[PDB]
CSV table of C-alpha atoms and ligand atoms in Angstrom, one decimal:
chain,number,residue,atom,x,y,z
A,1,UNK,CA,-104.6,-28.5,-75.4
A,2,UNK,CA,-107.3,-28.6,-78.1
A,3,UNK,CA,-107.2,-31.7,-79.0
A,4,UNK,CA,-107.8,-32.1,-75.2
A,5,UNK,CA,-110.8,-30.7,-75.0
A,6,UNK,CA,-111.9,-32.6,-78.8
A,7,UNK,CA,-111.0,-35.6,-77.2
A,8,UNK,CA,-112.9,-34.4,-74.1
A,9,UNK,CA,-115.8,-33.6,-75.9
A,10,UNK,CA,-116.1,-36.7,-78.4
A,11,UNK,CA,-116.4,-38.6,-75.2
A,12,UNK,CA,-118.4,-36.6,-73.3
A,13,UNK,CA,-120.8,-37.2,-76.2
A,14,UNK,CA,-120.2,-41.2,-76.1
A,15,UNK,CA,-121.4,-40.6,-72.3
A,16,UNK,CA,-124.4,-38.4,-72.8
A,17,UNK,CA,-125.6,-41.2,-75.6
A,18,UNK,CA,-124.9,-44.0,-73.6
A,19,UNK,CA,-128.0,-42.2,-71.2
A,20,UNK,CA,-129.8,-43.2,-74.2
A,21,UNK,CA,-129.7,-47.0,-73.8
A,22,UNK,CA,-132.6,-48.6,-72.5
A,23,UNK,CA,-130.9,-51.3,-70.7
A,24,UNK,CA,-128.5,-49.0,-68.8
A,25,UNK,CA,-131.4,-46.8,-68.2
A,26,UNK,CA,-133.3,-49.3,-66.7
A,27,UNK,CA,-129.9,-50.3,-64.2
A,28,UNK,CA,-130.1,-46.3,-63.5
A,29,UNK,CA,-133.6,-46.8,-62.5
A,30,UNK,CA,-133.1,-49.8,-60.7
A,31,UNK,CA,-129.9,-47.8,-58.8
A,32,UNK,CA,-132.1,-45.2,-58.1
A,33,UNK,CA,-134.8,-47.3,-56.8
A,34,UNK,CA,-132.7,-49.4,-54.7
A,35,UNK,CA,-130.9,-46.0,-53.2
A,36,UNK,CA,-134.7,-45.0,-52.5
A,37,UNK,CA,-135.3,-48.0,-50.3
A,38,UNK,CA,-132.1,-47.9,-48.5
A,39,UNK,CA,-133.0,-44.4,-47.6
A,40,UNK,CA,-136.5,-45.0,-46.2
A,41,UNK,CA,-135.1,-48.7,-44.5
A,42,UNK,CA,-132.5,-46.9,-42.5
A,43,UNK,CA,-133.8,-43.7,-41.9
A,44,UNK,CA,-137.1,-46.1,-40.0
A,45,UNK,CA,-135.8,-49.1,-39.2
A,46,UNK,CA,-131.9,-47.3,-37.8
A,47,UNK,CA,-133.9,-44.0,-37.1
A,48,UNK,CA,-131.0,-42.3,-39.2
A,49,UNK,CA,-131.7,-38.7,-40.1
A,50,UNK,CA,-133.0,-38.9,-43.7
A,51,UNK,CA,-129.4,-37.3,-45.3
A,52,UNK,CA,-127.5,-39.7,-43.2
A,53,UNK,CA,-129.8,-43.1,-44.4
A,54,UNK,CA,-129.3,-42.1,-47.9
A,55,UNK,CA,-125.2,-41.8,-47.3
A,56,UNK,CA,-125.2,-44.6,-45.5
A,57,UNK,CA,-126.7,-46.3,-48.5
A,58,UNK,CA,-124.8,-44.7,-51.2
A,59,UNK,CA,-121.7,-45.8,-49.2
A,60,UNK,CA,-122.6,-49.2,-48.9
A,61,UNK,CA,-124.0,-49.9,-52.0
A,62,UNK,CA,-121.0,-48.5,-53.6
A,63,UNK,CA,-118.3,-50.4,-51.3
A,64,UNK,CA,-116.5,-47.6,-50.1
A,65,UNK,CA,-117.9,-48.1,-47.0
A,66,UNK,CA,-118.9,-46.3,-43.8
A,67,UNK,CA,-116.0,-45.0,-41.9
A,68,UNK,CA,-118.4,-45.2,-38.1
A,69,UNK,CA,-121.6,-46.1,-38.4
A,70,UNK,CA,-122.9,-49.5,-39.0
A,71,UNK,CA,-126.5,-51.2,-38.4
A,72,UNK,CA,-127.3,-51.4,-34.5
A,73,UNK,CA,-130.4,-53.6,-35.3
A,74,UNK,CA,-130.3,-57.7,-36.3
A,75,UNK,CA,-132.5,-56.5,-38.5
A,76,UNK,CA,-130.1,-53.6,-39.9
A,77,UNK,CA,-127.0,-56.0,-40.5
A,78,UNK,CA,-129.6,-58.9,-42.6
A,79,UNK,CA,-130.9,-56.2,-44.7
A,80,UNK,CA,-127.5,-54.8,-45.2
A,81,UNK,CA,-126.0,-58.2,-46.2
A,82,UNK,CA,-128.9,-58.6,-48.6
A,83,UNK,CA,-128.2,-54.4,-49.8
A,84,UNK,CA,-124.2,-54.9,-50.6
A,85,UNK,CA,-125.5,-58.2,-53.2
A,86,UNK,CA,-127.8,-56.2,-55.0
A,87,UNK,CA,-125.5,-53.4,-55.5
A,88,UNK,CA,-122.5,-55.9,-57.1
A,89,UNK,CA,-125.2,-57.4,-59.2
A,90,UNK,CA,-125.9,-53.3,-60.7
A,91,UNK,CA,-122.4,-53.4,-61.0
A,92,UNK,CA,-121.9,-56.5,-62.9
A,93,UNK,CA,-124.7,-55.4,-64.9
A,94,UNK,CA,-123.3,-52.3,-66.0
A,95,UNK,CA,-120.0,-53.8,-66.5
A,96,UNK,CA,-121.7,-56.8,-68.7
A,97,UNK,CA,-123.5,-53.5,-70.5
A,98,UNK,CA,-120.2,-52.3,-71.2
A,99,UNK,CA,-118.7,-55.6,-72.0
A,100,UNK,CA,-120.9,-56.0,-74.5
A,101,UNK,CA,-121.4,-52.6,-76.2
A,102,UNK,CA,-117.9,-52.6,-77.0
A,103,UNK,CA,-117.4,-56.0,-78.7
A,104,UNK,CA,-120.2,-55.2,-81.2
B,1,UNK,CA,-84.2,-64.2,-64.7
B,2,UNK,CA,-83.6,-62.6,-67.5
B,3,UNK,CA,-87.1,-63.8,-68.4
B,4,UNK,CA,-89.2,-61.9,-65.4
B,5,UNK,CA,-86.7,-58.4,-66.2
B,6,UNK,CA,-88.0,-58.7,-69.9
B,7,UNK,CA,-91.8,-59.4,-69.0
B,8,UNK,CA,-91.7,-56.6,-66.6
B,9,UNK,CA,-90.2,-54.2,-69.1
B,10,UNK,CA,-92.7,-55.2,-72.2
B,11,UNK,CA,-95.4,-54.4,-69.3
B,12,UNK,CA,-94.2,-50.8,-68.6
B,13,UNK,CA,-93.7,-50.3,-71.8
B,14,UNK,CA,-97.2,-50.7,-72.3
B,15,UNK,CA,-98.1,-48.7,-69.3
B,16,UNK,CA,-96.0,-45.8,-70.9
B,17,UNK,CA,-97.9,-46.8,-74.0
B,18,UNK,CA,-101.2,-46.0,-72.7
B,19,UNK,CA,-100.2,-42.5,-71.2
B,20,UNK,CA,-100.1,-41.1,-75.0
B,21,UNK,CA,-103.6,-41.8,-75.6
B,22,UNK,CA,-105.4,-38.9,-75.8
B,23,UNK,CA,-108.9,-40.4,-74.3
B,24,UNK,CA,-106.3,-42.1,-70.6
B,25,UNK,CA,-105.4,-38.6,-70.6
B,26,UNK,CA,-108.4,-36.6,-70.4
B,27,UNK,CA,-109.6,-39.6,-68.0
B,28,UNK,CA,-106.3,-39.1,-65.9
B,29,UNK,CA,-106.8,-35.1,-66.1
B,30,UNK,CA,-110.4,-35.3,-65.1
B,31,UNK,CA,-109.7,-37.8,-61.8
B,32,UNK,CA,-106.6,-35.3,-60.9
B,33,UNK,CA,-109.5,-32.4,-60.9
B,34,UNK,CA,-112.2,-34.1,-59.1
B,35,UNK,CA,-109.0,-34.7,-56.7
B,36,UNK,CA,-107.9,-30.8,-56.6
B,37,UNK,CA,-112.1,-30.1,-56.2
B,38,UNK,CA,-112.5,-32.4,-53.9
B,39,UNK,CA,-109.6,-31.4,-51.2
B,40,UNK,CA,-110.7,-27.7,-52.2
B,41,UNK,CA,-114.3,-28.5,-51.3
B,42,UNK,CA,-113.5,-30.4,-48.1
B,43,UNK,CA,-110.6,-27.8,-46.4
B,44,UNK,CA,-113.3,-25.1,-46.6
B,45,UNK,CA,-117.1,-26.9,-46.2
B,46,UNK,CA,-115.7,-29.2,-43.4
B,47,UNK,CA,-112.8,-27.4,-42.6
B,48,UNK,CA,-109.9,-30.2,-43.1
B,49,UNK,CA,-106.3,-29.5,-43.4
B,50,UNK,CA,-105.3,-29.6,-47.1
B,51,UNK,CA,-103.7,-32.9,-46.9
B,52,UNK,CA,-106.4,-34.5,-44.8
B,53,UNK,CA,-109.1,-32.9,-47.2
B,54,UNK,CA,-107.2,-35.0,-50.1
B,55,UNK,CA,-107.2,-38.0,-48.2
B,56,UNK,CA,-110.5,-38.0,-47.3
B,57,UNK,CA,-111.3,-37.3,-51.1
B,58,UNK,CA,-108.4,-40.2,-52.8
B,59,UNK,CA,-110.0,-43.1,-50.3
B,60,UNK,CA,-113.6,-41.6,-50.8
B,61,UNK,CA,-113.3,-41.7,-54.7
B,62,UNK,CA,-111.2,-45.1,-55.3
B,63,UNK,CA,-113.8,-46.8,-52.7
B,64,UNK,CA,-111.4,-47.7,-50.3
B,65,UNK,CA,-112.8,-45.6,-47.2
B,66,UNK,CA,-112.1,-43.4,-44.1
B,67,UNK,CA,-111.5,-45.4,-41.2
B,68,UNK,CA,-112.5,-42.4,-38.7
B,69,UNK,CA,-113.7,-39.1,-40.8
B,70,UNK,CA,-116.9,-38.3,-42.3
B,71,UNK,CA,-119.0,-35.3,-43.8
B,72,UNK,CA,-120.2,-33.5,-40.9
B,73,UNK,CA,-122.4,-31.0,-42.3
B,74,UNK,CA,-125.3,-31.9,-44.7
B,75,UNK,CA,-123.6,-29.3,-47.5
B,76,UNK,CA,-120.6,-31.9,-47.1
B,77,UNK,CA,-122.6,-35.2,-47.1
B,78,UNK,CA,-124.7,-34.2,-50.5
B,79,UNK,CA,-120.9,-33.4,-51.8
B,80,UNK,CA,-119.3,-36.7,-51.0
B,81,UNK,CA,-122.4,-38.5,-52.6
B,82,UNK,CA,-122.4,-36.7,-55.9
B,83,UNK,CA,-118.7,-37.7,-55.7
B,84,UNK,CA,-118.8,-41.2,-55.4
B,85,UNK,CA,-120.7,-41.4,-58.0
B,86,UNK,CA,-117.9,-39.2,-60.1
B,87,UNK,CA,-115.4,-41.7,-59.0
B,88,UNK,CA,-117.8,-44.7,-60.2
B,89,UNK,CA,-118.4,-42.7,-63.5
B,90,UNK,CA,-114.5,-42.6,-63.7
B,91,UNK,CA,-113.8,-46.4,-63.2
B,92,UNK,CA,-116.3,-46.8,-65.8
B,93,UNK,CA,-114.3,-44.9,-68.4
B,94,UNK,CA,-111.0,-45.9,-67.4
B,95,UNK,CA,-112.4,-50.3,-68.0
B,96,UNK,CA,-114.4,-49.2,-70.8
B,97,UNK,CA,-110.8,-48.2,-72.2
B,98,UNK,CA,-109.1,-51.4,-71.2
B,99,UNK,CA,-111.7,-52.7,-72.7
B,100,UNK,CA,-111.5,-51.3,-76.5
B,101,UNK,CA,-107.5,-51.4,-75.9
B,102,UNK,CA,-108.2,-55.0,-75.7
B,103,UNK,CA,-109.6,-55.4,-79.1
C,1,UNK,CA,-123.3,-82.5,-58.5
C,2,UNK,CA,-121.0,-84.5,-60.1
C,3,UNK,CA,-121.0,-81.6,-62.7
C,4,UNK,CA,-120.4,-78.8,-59.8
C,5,UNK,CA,-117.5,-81.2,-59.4
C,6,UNK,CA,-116.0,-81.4,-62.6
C,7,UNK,CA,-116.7,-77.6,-63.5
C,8,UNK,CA,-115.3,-76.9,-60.2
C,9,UNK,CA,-112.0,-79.2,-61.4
C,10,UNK,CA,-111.9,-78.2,-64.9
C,11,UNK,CA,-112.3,-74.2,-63.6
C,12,UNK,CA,-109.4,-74.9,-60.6
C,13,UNK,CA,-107.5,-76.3,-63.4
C,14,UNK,CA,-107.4,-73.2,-65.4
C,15,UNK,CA,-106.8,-70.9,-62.2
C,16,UNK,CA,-103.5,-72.8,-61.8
C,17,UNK,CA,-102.6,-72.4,-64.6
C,18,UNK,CA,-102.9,-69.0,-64.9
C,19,UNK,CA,-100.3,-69.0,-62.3
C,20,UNK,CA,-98.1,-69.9,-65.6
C,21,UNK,CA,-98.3,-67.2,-67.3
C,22,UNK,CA,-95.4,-64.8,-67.0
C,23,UNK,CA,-97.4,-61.2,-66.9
C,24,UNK,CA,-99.4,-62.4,-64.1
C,25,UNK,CA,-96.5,-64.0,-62.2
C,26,UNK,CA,-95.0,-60.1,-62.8
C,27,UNK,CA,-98.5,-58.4,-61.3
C,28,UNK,CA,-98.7,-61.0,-58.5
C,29,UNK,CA,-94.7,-60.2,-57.4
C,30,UNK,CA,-95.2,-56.5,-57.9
C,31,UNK,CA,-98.2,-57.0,-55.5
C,32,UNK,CA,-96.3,-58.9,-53.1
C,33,UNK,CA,-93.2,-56.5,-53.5
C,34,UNK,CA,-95.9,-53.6,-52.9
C,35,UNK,CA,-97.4,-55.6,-49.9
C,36,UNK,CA,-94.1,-55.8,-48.2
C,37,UNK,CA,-93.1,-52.5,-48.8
C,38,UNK,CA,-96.5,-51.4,-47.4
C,39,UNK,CA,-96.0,-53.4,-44.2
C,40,UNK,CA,-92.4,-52.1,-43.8
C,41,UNK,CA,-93.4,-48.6,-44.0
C,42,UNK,CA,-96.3,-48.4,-41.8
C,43,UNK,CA,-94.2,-50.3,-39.1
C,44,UNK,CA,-91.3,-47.7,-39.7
C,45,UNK,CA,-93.4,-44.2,-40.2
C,46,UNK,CA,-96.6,-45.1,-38.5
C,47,UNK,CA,-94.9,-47.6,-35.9
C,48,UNK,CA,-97.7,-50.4,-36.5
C,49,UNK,CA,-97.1,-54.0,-34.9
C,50,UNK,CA,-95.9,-55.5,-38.1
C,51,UNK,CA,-99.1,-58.0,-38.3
C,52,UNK,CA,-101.1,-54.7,-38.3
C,53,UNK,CA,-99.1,-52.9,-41.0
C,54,UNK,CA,-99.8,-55.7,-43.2
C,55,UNK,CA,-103.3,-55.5,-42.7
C,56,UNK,CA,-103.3,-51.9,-43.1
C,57,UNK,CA,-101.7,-52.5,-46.3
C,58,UNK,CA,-103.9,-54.6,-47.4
C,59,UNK,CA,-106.9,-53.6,-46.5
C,60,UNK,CA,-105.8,-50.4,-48.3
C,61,UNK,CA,-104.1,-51.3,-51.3
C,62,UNK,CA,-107.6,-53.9,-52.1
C,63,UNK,CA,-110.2,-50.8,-51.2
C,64,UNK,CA,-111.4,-52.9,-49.2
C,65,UNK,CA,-110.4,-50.0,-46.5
C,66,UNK,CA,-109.7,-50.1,-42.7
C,67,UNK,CA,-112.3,-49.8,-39.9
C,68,UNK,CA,-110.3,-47.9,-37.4
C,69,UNK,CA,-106.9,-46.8,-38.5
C,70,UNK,CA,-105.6,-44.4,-41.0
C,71,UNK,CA,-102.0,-42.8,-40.8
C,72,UNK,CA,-101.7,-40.2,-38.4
C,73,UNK,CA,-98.5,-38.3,-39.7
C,74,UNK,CA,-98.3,-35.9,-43.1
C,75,UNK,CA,-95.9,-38.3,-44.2
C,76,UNK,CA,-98.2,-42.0,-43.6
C,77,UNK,CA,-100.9,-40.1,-45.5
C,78,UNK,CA,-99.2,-39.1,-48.4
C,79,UNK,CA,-97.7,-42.8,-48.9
C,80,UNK,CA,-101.3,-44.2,-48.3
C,81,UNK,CA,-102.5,-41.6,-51.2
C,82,UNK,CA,-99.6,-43.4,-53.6
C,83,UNK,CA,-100.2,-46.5,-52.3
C,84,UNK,CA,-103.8,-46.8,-52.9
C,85,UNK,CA,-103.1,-45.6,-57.1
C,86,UNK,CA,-100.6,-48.6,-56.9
C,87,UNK,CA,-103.0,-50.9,-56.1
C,88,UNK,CA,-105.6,-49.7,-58.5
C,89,UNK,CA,-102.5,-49.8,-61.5
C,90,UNK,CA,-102.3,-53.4,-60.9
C,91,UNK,CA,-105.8,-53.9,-60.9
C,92,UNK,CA,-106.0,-52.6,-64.1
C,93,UNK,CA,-103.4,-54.7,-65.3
C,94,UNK,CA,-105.1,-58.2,-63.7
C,95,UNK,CA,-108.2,-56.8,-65.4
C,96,UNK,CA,-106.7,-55.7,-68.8
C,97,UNK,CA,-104.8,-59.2,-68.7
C,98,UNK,CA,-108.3,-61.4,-68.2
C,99,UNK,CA,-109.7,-58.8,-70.9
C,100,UNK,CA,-106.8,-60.2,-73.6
C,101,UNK,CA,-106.4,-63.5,-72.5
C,102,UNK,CA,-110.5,-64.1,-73.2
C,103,UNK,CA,-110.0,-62.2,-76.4
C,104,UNK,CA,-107.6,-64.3,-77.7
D,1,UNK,CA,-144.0,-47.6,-70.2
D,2,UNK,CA,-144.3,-51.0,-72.2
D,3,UNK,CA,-140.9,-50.4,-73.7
D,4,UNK,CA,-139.5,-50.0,-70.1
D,5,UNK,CA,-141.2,-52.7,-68.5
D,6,UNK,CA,-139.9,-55.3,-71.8
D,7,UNK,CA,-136.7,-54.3,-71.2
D,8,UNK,CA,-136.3,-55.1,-67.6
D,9,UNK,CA,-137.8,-58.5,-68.0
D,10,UNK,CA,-135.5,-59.3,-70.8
D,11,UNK,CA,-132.7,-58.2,-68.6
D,12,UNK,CA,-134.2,-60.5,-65.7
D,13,UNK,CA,-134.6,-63.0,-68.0
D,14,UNK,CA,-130.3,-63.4,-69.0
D,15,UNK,CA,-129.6,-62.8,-65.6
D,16,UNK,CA,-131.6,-66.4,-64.7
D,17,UNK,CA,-130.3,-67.8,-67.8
D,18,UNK,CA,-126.9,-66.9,-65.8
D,19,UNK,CA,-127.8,-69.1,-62.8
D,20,UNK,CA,-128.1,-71.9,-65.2
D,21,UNK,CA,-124.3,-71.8,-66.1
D,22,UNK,CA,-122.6,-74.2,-64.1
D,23,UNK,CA,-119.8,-72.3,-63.5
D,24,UNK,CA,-121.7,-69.1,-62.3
D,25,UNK,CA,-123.0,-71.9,-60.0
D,26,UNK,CA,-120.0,-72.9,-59.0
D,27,UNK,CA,-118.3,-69.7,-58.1
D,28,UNK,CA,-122.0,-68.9,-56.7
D,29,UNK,CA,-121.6,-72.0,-54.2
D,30,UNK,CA,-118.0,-71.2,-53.5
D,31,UNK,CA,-118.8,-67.3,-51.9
D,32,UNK,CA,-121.7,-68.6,-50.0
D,33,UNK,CA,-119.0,-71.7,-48.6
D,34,UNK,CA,-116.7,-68.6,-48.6
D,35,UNK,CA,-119.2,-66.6,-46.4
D,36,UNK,CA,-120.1,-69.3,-44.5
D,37,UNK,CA,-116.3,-70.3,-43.1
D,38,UNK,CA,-116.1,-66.4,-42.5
D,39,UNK,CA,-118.9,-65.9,-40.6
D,40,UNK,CA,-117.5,-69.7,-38.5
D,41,UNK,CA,-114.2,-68.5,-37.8
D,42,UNK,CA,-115.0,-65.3,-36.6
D,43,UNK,CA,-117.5,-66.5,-34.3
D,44,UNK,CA,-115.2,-68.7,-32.8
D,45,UNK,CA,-111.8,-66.9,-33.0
D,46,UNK,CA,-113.4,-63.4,-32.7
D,47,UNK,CA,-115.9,-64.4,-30.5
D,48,UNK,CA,-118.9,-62.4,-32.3
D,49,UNK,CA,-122.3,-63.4,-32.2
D,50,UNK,CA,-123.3,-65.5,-36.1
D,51,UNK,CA,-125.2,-62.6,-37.5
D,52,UNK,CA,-122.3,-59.9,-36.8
D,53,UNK,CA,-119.8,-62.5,-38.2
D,54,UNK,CA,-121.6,-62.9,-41.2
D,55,UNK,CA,-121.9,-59.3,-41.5
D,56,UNK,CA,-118.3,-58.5,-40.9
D,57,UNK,CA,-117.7,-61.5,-43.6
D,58,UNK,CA,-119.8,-60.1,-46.1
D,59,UNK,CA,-118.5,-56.4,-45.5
D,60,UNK,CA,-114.9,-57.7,-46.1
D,61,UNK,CA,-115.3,-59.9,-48.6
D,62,UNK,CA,-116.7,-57.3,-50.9
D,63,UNK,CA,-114.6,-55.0,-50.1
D,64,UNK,CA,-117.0,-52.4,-48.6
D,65,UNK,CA,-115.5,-52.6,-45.4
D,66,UNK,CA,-116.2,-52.9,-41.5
D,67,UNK,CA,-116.9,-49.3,-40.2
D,68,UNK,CA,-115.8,-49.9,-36.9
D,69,UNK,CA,-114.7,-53.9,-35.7
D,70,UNK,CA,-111.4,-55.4,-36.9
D,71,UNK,CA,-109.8,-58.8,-35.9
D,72,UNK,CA,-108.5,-58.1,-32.2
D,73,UNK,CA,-106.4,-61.5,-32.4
D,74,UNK,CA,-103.0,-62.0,-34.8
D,75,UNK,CA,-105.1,-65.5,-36.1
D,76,UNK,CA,-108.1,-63.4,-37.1
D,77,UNK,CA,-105.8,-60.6,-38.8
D,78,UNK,CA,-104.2,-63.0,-41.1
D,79,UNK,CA,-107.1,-64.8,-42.0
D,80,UNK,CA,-108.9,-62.0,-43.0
D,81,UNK,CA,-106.1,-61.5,-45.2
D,82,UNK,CA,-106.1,-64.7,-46.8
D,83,UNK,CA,-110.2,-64.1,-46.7
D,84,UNK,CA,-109.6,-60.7,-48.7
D,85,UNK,CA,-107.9,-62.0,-50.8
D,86,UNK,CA,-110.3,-64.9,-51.9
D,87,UNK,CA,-112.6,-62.4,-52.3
D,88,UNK,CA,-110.4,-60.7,-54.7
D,89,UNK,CA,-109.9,-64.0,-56.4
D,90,UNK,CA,-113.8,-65.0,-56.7
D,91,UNK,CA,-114.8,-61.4,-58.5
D,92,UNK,CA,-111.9,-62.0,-61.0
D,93,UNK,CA,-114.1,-65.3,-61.3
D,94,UNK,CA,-117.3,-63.5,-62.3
D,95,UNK,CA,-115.8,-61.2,-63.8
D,96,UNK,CA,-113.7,-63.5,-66.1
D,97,UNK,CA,-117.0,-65.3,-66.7
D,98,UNK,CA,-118.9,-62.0,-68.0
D,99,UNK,CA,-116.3,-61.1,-70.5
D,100,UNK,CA,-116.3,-64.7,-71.8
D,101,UNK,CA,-120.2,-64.9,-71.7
D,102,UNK,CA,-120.1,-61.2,-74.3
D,103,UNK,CA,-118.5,-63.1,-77.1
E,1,CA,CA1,-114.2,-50.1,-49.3
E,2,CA,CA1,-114.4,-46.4,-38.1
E,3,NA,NA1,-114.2,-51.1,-52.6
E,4,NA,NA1,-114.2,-52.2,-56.0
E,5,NA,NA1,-114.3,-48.2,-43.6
């Protein structure tokens, strides 16, 4: 049990320091950024309630997906599309991130 | 075969293998209590049955999905956002791990 | 484009054979053992169309999650909870398998 | 901040230098080939109109997931099966290609 919570903190530390990358800071940034413009997109272009633009982002750019709503607009779906890419390239970059900070 | 039997076994060997390190552990631990927060938070905030409040929370933090249920309240919607992310943090640790058990 | 060509041989190449290697011949039969096991359940329990349990299962045990469906007894749901950690077992084992195999 | 705006560039900069790779091409041309059949066959088997069978294409191949449509025919059910599936195979791809692109 405490060697639980050693372990637990030792890599709880390894977490906190990793916020201190600049390259995974800037992917935050960029996630951030990109979860921003989601928001305001569907919130004015799908008139979704401001809460509900940002969970439709977060679900989308995430892949877990929405369970009912989905664009009504043409203009919705293309910008979707083009949202869904730009979160798997985040991903990838994080993952490269990680990749690489562990064959150092 | 002989052959796939022996692969399979040197495979869940492994598997067994990895449930002793300490670090899988604490990573298995903390997804099991996200799990047990997140079917707490759920039955009470959007008022789910127990078993429907963990599968709403197991397909919400692998990414797989509800095909019918969301957060109806805002309280619930902010939730399920901040866990995501959890989940994503969790993924993170548990292939950061495959990847050092790699090497 | 005669290089997309022959990268595009040389990469197929090395797909197949993958297919040789014993451990992933192991994940890919375990996957098929779990897919079948998933389409005979949700027929049985959740009385699917066996096309549609299939794509249940599948949909579910890849994340990729379904659009309209989810099990409607205690019983479909718990299976569906196990079934999804399944599928994310032996995506951790295709994953840790390309980690060692590039390692090499 | 300087420092920020360095790093982001450099980043940009590897993730062009990636487009360069002809393999990264090559799986690159493969999902949009991918996406294109998708978004053919279910305009034709589904019957949707091109824009919501690319969408539903895109939503499946990346595993997000279709919030409310599904194949109605048995054809378009097991092709989006097989579809899923090459899905699954092309991010092993990339994925393959950014651990061999760390060492
Ligand atoms: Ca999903
Ligand atoms: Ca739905
Ligand atoms: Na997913
Ligand atoms: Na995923
Ligand atoms: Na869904």
């Amino acid at each position: 049990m405490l060697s639980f919570l050693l372990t637990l903190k030792r890599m709880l530390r390894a977490c906190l320091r990793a916020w201190k990358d600049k390259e995974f800071q800037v992917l935050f940034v960029l996630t951030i950024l990109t979860l921003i413009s989601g928001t305001i997109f569907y919130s004015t272009v799908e008139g979704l309630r401001p809460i509900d633009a940002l969970y439709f982002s977060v679900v989308t750019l995430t892949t877990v997906g929405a369970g009912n709503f989905e664009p009504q607009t043409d203009f919705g779906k293309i910008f979707t599309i083009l949202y869904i890419f730009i979160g798997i390239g985040l991903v990838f970059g994080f993952i490269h991130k990680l990749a690489v900070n562990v064959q150092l």
